[PDB]
Write a protein that binds this ligand. Structure first.
Ligand code: MG
Ligand code: MG
Ligand code: MG
Ligand code: MG
Ligand code: MG
Ligand code: MG
Ligand code: MG
Ligand code: MG
Ligand code: MG
Ligand code: MG
Ligand code: MG
Ligand code: MG
Ligand code: MG
Ligand code: MG
Ligand code: MG
Ligand code: MG
Ligand code: MG
Ligand code: MG
Ligand code: MG
Ligand code: MG
Ligand code: MG
Ligand code: MG
Ligand code: MG
Ligand code: MG
Ligand code: MG
Ligand code: MG
Ligand code: MG
Ligand code: MG
Ligand code: MG
Ligand code: MG
Ligand code: MG
Ligand code: MG
Ligand code: MG
Ligand code: MG
Ligand code: MG
Ligand code: MG
Ligand code: MG
Ligand code: MG
Ligand code: MG
Ligand code: MG
Ligand code: MG
Ligand code: MG
Ligand code: MG
Ligand code: MG
Ligand code: MG
Ligand code: MG
Ligand code: MG
Ligand code: MG
Ligand code: MG
Ligand code: MG
Ligand code: MG
Ligand code: MG
Ligand code: MG
Ligand code: MG
Ligand code: MG
Ligand code: MG
Ligand code: MG
Ligand code: MG
Ligand code: MG
Ligand code: MG
Ligand code: MG
Ligand code: MG
Ligand code: MG
Ligand code: MG
Ligand code: MG
Ligand code: MG
Ligand code: MG
Ligand code: MG
Ligand code: MG
Ligand code: MG
Ligand code: MG
Ligand code: MG
Ligand code: MG
Ligand code: MG
Ligand code: MG
Ligand code: MG
Ligand code: MG
Ligand code: MG
Ligand code: MG
Ligand code: MG
Ligand code: MG
Ligand code: MG
Ligand code: MG
Ligand code: MG
Ligand code: MG
Ligand code: MG
Ligand code: MG
Ligand code: MG
Ligand code: MG
Ligand code: MG
Ligand code: MG
Ligand code: MG
Ligand code: MG
Ligand code: MG
Ligand code: MG
Ligand code: MG
Ligand code: MG
Ligand code: MG
Ligand code: MG
Ligand code: MG
Lengths: 80, 111, 138, 175
RNA sequence: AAUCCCCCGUGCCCAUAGCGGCGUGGAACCACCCGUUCCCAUUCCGAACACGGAAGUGAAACGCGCCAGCGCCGAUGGUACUGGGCGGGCGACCGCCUGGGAGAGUAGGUCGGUGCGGGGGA
RNA sequence: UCGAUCAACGGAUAAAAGUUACCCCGGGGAUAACAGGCUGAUCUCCCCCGAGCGUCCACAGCGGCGGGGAGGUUUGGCACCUCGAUGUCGGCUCGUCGCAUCCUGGGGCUGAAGAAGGUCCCAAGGGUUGGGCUGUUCGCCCAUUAAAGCGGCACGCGAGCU
RNA sequence: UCGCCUCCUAAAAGGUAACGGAGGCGCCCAAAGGUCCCCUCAGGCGGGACGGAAAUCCGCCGGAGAGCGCAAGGGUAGAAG
RNA sequence: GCUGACUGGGGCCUGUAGAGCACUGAUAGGGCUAGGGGGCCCACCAGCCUACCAAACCCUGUCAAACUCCGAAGGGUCCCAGGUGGAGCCUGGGAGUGAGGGCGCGAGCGAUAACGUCCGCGUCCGAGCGCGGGAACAACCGAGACCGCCAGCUAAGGCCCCCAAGUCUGGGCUAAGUGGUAAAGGAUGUGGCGCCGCGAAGACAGCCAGGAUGUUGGCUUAGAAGCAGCCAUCAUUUAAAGAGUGCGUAAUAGCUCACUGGUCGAGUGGCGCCGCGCCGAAAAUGAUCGGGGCUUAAGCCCAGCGCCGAAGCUGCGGGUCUGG
RNA sequence: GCCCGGAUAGCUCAGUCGGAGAGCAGGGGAUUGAAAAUCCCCGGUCCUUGGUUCGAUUCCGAGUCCGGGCACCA
C-alpha cells in the first residue's frame, strides 16, 4: 500500500565489527573480526570462515596492516 | 587491455602457494634457459639458487631441467631444507618444469 | 513552477538550518546580486514571486539568474492527527551569505530597484550587492 | 597603473585580534619563500579594488624591501562577505600562470545595432614570463558575427607570452 | 671475494611509481623468432598452452631514460567543524574562552623508490 | 526422520463468532466526549511590497503574486487539573466588560457643486426596535429605525428558571 | 500492523524509539555443489552478408560502472565472475 | 584482595560534524554536438537552418538521511602507569522497580506548533516541595541540611526606600519611563566610524536677473500655437532657456521651472556601517517594572573598589558510626 | 466564505505531438415538375489578466461571470 503505513520494518542489528584490536592477546580460535565482505583480509595466523569471519589460528597478539590497494590485513603474531 | 592473462595466472597460482607458508621453490624458464630459486617470504629473501645458466650445460631443455633440479636438492638439502612447496609460476606443470620438479627430489619433495 | 523531475526519494527528513555557509556566496553570473542574510526554506512559490516581480520590473528586458533551486520536498498532514508521514506538498534551503537571483544587463537604478522589490517577496532579510575583485576570476 | 600597499610580519598574534585591529591576516610565499604577514584592511581594500589579482602588486613591507606580488587567493568569510585572509604570491624570473583581464574592442562589428553582446569571460588564464606582463589583451576581431565562438589563439597574445589555454573554449557570441 | 654499473628473477612500499610523447638497448640475459617430429595443445586456430630449436630482429613486448598536456601526490597560512568551559536570541539560530582542527583551494612535488638472489661487467 | 500461514510467527485448548440503548462490578482523569489550559495549522483582523484596474494618475476607491504579524471569538492538535461527578445546546432573567465602532459627537482625504455617499482617523458616554419561520444559535423574511454592531465573562449565567 | 533479511533514522565502537522514510523473504540449484586446470567484464568508437539500437564476427580504447539465481548492502577479476 | 570510576602515554577501530561532486541522483547559465520537434525543398537516397526537444562532452554554478574522492573534534577497546574509593571482583540471602518528568545538546515525527510526541548523551526533580537567588514557582542560577551558637568568610544574586549592603568612583550612551516589548518593514530621532560627489575658477539655501529663432513643430486640427492629444523633439543663436517641467487655457494674453549670470560667503548633498532609541503596536473584572519611586539615573554599555548575602566554608562545643 | 468544474462563430460540443474543427443554423448549387431528405461550397481579438516558450485556444498561475462537493450544538 501507500499511506496508512506501507513501511515499518527493519531487521535485527547484526553486531558486526572488529572484536579484538591491535596489540591484544588472543588464543587459537578467538574471532578477531565480524564482517560482511572481505573488508579485512585474513593475514598471518588468521583464518576465514564461510561468512568472512576472521579468527586467530594460534595464540598471540594481533597486528593490523594496511597494504594500500591490497586491502587491510589482520595477522596474529606468535610468542604464543 | 590491462593486466594480462600471464600476470593473472601468475598471481593466482602464486598467492595460493604463498598461503600454505612453506618456503617457495620458484621457477623461471626462458626460451633458452631454466632457473629455480628457493625463497622465504616475510624475510623477502632467496636462500638456494640454481640455474642452467650458471651450471653452463645444454641440449634437451627438459633433461637440462631434471639436472638443475637435482642441482637444487643437493645444494639445498645441505642447508637443512627438506620440505617446500612448488611455485610453478605461470607455467603448466609439464615437460621442462615438471622435469625440474621430479628432478628436485633426492631431497626436498613431495613433488 | 519550480521543482525537480525524477526524485530518488519522495519525502525527506527536515534537518537543521545550521551553520550558515557553503557555496554560492560569490556572485558569479551578473552585475548585481541579492544575498541572503538569514536562513530559511524558501518556497518554489516565493522564488517565482521574486522572478516575476523583476521581469515585470523591466520591460521583459534585462537578464535574470535565480541560482537557488527547490529540490527539498516539503510534507504536510491534512488536519488529521499522527499516522504515517506525508503528504505532498518544494523548498530551497538557504543560509546566510547566499546569492539568489542576481540580475544583469540593466542599469544600476534598475537592478537595485528590481532587487529591492524582489526582496520584499522573501521571508528573510536581504542584502543587495554589486560585484568585486573579491568575486575573483575563476 | 602601478600599485603598492604596505605589509608586516607575524608569528603569534591571534588573527582574530589583528582582524579586530583593522588589519588583515595573510601569507607571503613562492617556491623560495614562505612567510606570515598582515596588511591594513582599508588600505588593502582601496588597492585591491583596482588591482584585483589582475595587475601586479608591489607590497613593500619592512627590511625595507619591495616585493613584486600577484594575489593568488582571497578568502572572504561568507556571512559578512568581507575578506578574512590573503595569499600574496611573490614573483621571480620563472614563467607563471595568471588571469589577464580582457579589453573587448569594436562596435557590435557585424549585426551592428545589434546582435546580443554576450561576454563569456572577463579573463584568460595565461602563462607569462613575469618580466613582461600584458596588463590587458585587446580583443577586437571585428569579424564578430551571429552564433560564432572565438576559441583561444585568435586572441592578440601580446608580445611576451603564450596562453595557459585550453586552446578550445568560449569567449563571446551573438544570438 | 666488498664496492659500483647493466641485465634476469623475485619481494616490499602501494599511482611521487600511471597515461601520453620522445629516445634508446640485442655481446649477455629476455623477447619476439624457426619449426610442430615427439610430450602436450586449441568447444575452430601451436594465437594461447606445449615441446625440439637458433638462421634473423629489437619491429612488437620488456628494460633504461628524458618531457609536467593529463593523471597521481600536496604544504604553509586562513577558515569550517568540535572535546571542555561560558554567554546571547521569541525563534531560526549567533557569539567568547581554552584545547584539538579539516575539506576545498593556493604554493609546490612527481615520469618512482627499494630488499634478497643470480648472470655479467668493477 | 516426518505431520506446524502453531504467520497474533517464544507457539493459552485437540476443539470457538456476535450483541446489549435492558445492562452490572472493579478501576482510570494512566484515556475519550464538555469546559479550561498549552499551541495557533485553521479561523478573524492588521500590516509590508505594489503587478495591475481606476480616462490621466498621489493607493478617491481597488490590489495580483509573495512577505511579516496581532488576536484567541471557529474547526482542530495535544492529553495537563478534574471520571469517590467541573450537568451539555437553546431560550428567559440579570448583567458587566473589550473595541477590531452599528448609531449618535469630533475629524482628514474624496474621482467632495449642494444634499446624499465613499474610505480612513478619534471616540466605549449612552443607545442599539417589534414581528413570521425553525428547538434552534445562525440565517431568511415582514414592518420600522439615528442604528437594528462584533466579541469576552466555564460557547457568562440550570444550589436563578425553563 | 504482528516473525525474518537489507538500507536509512543511528549522533564515525556495539546498541538504540515512533501507526518515521524505503524495499525484500516463507524459496531456489544434482548443478547454481567439491576440486584441478584455463579464461576475463560492461560500455564507447571503427569495420563486416542477410543483422536493425541491439544475434554473430574483427580491431582499438575500456580497472571495473558487468557478473555473482532473487531485495538491498558489504564485497569481489591477484575472483567470489 | 588493587584490579574500580576518572586520569597520562601508546597502539588499533570508526565514516558522523564540516566539506566535497569522483559514484547515485538532482541542478542554474553558456558552448559544441548525436536523434528529431519538422519550416518544409523532397515526396529518391537527399537536405539544410534552428531564439523548441537533446543524449553524452567542455566551461561556469549549486543540492542530497537512504550520494562520498575526502574527513576533524570526540568515542570505543587493549597495554603500561597514577588512582585505598560507601571503589572493584567472586559466591550466596533479601529486595524494590519495570507509569517517569523537566532542562541542555543531537536527531525523527509534528507546522523550523504545543507545558506535543519518540529515541540518543548528560543533568536535575523524582527521593533534595529542606536552605539562598529568581516577586511568588518540583526540576533555571547558588548549594548536597548529624546536632547546637545573639561568632566569621563567601556563592548565586544584590547595596535609592519597602529590604541586609554604595544614593561608590571614573568614562561614554538614552529622553522613550525606552528600560519595564513583539516581526517584517520603515523613518533629516540621536551619538560615533567611514567613503564618495560639489565648493572660495566661491558651491548648497534664499534674493536680485534671461525667461529663445525658424514655429502655428511636423502631427492634429473650429484651435492645442509644450499644459484636451500620438510625436519626425530636429537646423540654429549664445556666458544662455527643454518646439518647452508645471499652474494657466476664449487654442493665444498673462505665469513657473528647468538650464544660465549675479548677490553672499562656508561648507553642502550622497552612501555605507556600529550604538542606543522611534513607529509599526487592538481584548475583554482594577491597575502596576514585585511596589514605592527612578532621568548627568535607582535605565543601558565599559573599567574599578568595598560591602551585603545560604543550612556551602570556617571558628567553638557535642553525638553517632567507620578507620587508625 | 470554504476545496473540485466548464466558457469557444449564431446556438450545440469534439479538440493531452505546443505551430483551429465537423455538425445543426443561413445563403448557393446539384437532385426534382417544385420541394423535403441526401451530397457539394461559403465567417470566433477562441472567458480577461501575469507567466514559460522564438512561439501557448492547446503548458502554469491565480482572479472572475457561472456548475459540483462542505462542518454548530450538545
Ligand atoms: Mg540495521
Ligand atoms: Mg552560503
Ligand atoms: Mg564552491
Ligand atoms: Mg514554510
Ligand atoms: Mg483524536
Ligand atoms: Mg524581506
Ligand atoms: Mg590513490
Ligand atoms: Mg640477440
Ligand atoms: Mg645482431
Ligand atoms: Mg622497441
Ligand atoms: Mg589537497
Ligand atoms: Mg592547516
Ligand atoms: Mg563547544
Ligand atoms: Mg546555549
Ligand atoms: Mg588540506
Ligand atoms: Mg609520472
Ligand atoms: Mg627490484
Ligand atoms: Mg652480482
Ligand atoms: Mg502472539
Ligand atoms: Mg510474539
Ligand atoms: Mg526474537
Ligand atoms: Mg496447542
Ligand atoms: Mg434498543
Ligand atoms: Mg428493565
Ligand atoms: Mg443484568
Ligand atoms: Mg462503575
Ligand atoms: Mg467540540
Ligand atoms: Mg462548561
Ligand atoms: Mg477540549
Ligand atoms: Mg477547569
Ligand atoms: Mg497567531
Ligand atoms: Mg500568537
Ligand atoms: Mg498589524
Ligand atoms: Mg480549544
Ligand atoms: Mg490527563
Ligand atoms: Mg505522555
Ligand atoms: Mg470526569
Ligand atoms: Mg470531591
Ligand atoms: Mg459535587
Ligand atoms: Mg479605536
Ligand atoms: Mg460617527
Ligand atoms: Mg461624522
Ligand atoms: Mg457634503
Ligand atoms: Mg467623512
Ligand atoms: Mg459607547
Ligand atoms: Mg456597551
Ligand atoms: Mg401564527
Ligand atoms: Mg439555519
Ligand atoms: Mg429582530
Ligand atoms: Mg454581552
Ligand atoms: Mg468552545
Ligand atoms: Mg454556557
Ligand atoms: Mg435545573
Ligand atoms: Mg550506504
Ligand atoms: Mg553506530
Ligand atoms: Mg555514536
Ligand atoms: Mg511486505
Ligand atoms: Mg566443476
Ligand atoms: Mg572488453
Ligand atoms: Mg564490446
Ligand atoms: Mg558495430
Ligand atoms: Mg558490482
Ligand atoms: Mg544483489
Ligand atoms: Mg552492492
Ligand atoms: Mg593501584
Ligand atoms: Mg586511546
Ligand atoms: Mg552534511
Ligand atoms: Mg555528482
Ligand atoms: Mg551524509
Ligand atoms: Mg587529503
Ligand atoms: Mg594500575
Ligand atoms: Mg555499590
Ligand atoms: Mg544479591
Ligand atoms: Mg516501560
Ligand atoms: Mg521516556
Ligand atoms: Mg513532554
Ligand atoms: Mg519541546
Ligand atoms: Mg532525562
Ligand atoms: Mg513516585
Ligand atoms: Mg539527587
Ligand atoms: Mg509549594
Ligand atoms: Mg527557591
Ligand atoms: Mg524564592
Ligand atoms: Mg524569596
Ligand atoms: Mg528547589
Ligand atoms: Mg551531608
Ligand atoms: Mg556588583
Ligand atoms: Mg530588592
Ligand atoms: Mg538599606
Ligand atoms: Mg553616583
Ligand atoms: Mg516603564
Ligand atoms: Mg514599557
Ligand atoms: Mg555616570
Ligand atoms: Mg561592574
Ligand atoms: Mg564580608
Ligand atoms: Mg567538631
Ligand atoms: Mg558509615
Ligand atoms: Mg430540371
Ligand atoms: Mg432547385
Ligand atoms: Mg452554540
Amino acid at each position: 500500500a501507500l499511506a496508512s503505513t506501507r513501511n515499518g520494518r527493519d531487521s535485527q542489528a547484526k553486531r558486526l565489527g572488529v572484536k579484538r584490536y591491535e596489540g591484544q592477546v588472543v588464543r587459537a580460535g578467538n574471532i578477531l573480526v565480524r564482517q560482511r565482505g572481505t573488508r579485512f583480509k585474513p593475514g598471518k595466523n588468521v583464518g576465514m570462515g564461510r561468512d568472512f569471519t576472521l579468527f586467530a589460528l594460534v595464540d598471540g597478539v594481533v597486528e593490523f596492516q594496511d597494504r594500500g590497494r591490497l586491502g587491510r590485513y589482520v595477522h596474529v603474531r606468535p610468542l604464543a | 587491455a590491462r593486466l594480462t592473462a600471464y600476470e593473472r595466472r601468475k598471481f593466482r597460482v602464486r598467492n595460493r602457494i604463498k598461503r600454505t607458508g612453506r618456503l617457495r621453490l620458484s621457477v623461471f624458464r626462458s626460451l633458452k634457459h631454466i632457473y629455480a630459486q628457493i625463497i622465504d617470504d616475510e624475510k623477502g629473501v632467496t636462500l638456494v639458487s640454481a640455474s642452467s645458466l650458471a651450471l653452463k650445460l645444454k641440449g634437451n631443455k627438459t633433461e637440462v631441467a631434471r639436472q638443475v633440479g637435482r642441482a637444487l636438492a643437493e645444494k639445498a638439502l645441505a642447508l637443512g631444507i627438506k620440505q617446500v612447496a612448488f611455485d610453478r609460476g605461470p607455467y603448466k606443470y609439464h615437460g621442462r618444469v615438471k622435469a625440474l620438479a621430479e628432478g628436485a627430489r633426492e631431497g626436498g619433495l613431495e613433488f | 513552477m519550480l521543482m525537480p523531475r525524477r526524485m530518488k526519494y519522495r519525502k525527506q527528513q527536515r534537518g537543521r538550518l545550521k551553520g550558515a555557509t557553503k557555496g554560492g556566496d560569490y556572485v558569479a553570473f551578473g552585475d548585481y546580486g541579492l544575498v541572503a542574510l538569514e536562513p530559511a526554506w524558501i518556497t518554489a512559490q516565493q522564488i517565482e514571486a521574486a522572478r516575476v516581480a523583476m521581469v515585470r520590473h523591466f520591460r521583459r528586458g534585462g537578464k535574470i539568474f535565480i541560482r537557488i533551486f527547490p529540490d527539498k520536498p516539503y510534507t504536510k498532514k491534512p488536519l488529521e492527527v499522527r499516522m504515517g508521514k506525508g503528504k505532498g506538498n518544494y523548498v530551497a534551503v538557504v543560509k546566510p551569505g547566499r546569492v539568489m537571483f542576481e540580475v544583469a544587463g540593466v542599469t544600476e537604478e534598475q537592478a537595485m530597484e528590481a532587487l529591492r522589490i524582489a526582496g520584499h517577496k522573501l521571508p528573510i532579510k536581504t542584502k543587495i550587492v554589486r560585484r568585486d575583485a573579491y568575486d575573483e576570476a575563476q | 597603473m602601478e600599485y603598492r600597499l604596505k605589509a608586516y610580519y607575524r608569528e603569534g598574534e591571534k588573527p582574530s585580534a589583528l582582524r579586530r585591529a583593522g588589519k588583515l591576516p595573510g601569507v607571503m610565499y613562492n617556491r623560495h619563500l614562505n612567510r606570515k604577514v598582515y596588511v591594513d584592511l582599508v588600505e588593502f581594500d582601496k588597492v585591491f579594488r583596482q588591482a584585483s589579482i589582475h595587475h601586479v602588486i608591489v607590497l613593500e613591507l619592512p627590511d625595507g624591501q619591495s616585493l613584486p606580488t600577484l594575489v593568488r587567493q582571497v578568502n572572504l568569510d561568507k556571512r559578512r562577505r568581507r575578506p578574512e585572509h590573503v595569499d600574496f604570491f611573490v614573483l621571480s624570473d620563472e614563467p607563471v600562470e595568471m588571469y589577464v583581464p580582457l579589453r573587448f574592442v569594436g562596435t557590435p562589428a557585424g549585426v551592428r545595432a545589434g546582435g546580443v553582446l554576450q561576454e563569456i569571460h572577463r579573463d584568460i588564464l595565461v602563462k607569462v614570463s613575469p618580466r613582461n606582463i600584458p596588463e590587458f589583451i585587446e580583443v577586437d576581431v571585428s569579424g564578430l558575427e551571429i552564433g560564432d565562438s572565438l576559441h583561444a589563439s585568435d586572441l592578440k597574445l601580446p608580445p611576451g607570452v603564450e596562453l595557459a589555454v585550453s586552446p578550445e573554449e568560449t569567449i563571446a557570441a551573438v544570438v
